[PDB]
Amino acid sequence: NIKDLLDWYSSGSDTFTNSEVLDNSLGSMRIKNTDGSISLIIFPSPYYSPAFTKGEKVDLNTKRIKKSQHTSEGTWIHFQISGVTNTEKLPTPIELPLKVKVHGKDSPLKYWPKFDKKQLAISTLDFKIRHQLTQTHGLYRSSDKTGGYWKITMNDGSTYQSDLSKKFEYNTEKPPINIDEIKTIEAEIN
């Protein structure tokens, strides 16, 4: 499972802002990005179905599930999953409270980016978190760091959790959350 996790999380993600919705139906979205590329994004979760209609603008913070294809028309087509949110941006980028424990002991962060989007898909948060964990805390880089979890507690107390030993559960993904409403984010590596 490690190679798969290391592969998925140490690599980057695609970020596109103000992409236009071409189509939204039957669990997938066809989106036109400002760089001219076309994104075909699937939404497998019955709990997360973007309601954006044709012509609406959206932001993408997503991962490719297949190799992008350069068409004969000179257009890149990306095959991504989830990560479609509105375009609202916070007045100024904010620091999300991420507390990390590795084998029981607190572990200070390094290179934890600020966030400027009002809403982010839970899967986006998941990859941002684990990416941080793999780059600075060695998650998936050594046999003593292949599991654990991350947990986001909202201000109203609701929580979101993800097992670090498994790939994110896109199939049950909940709707995007307002990050300015996140109380804490904690992650333990075991």
Curated annotation (Swiss-Prot):
GO terms for cellular component: extracellular region. Its main location: secreted. It is found in: Secreted. Disulfide bonds: none annotated. Keywords: Secreted, Signal, Superantigen, Toxin, Virulence. Coiled coil: none annotated. GO terms for molecular function: toxin activity. Responsible for the symptoms of toxic shock syndrome. Belongs to the staphylococcal/streptococcal toxin family. This is Toxic shock syndrome toxin-1. The gene is tst. The chain holds residues 45 to 234 of 234 of the full protein.
